[PDB]
Amino acid sequence: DIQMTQTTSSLSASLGDRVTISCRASQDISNYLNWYQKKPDGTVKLLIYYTSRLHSGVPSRFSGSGSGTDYSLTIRNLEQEDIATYFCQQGYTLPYTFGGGTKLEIKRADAAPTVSIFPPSSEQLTSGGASVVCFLNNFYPKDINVKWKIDGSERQNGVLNSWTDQDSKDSTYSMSSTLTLTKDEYERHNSYTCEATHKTSTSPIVKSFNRNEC
């Protein structure tokens, strides 16, 4: 179909700066470009139709432009509700295709994860469970790559992450990175590390616990 590409998946700036979201289609769709805003709320709303016509109701802040294969939405004074994801769609033909989106985020000053690994609770172990939780908390940028290692080598087939969308107080983020082995496997190795790479630190953040702790 017609490929609608948006090169930047997340974009950040501060509440008062102008933001410009791009969108480039495969073929000339002759100004048949629409922009939709998807708020964290879930609802979707039409902002602009036919390249630059403000849908009725939108604040003059939003501005549309382009013509050909290149287009773009440009918010003048970023504000509260503006923090959502922005999609572009083409009207030129079937099937209709929309861009992948561009998620906005409030720009903050750096941070580093406050890691903290945890050994499988005695209770869980009773039921043969084996989950080694690790909490990186309050970091920024959200670009954070972890690496589980049980007794030397890495581990992938079993890790379990989950992030936390930018906080209403600062920005930051946080993520639970659970690793689940079987009781039998837990008791078969030692020195469990929660390796975490994150821009702010040139030296990879490590945190570990050997079964022989107490």
Partner: peptide, 12 residues
């Protein structure tokens, strides 16, 4: 119809 502009969506 030529604008293919979906407007007035649902919640989900």
């Amino acid at each position: 119809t030529s604008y293919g502009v979906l407007d007035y969506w649902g919640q989900g």
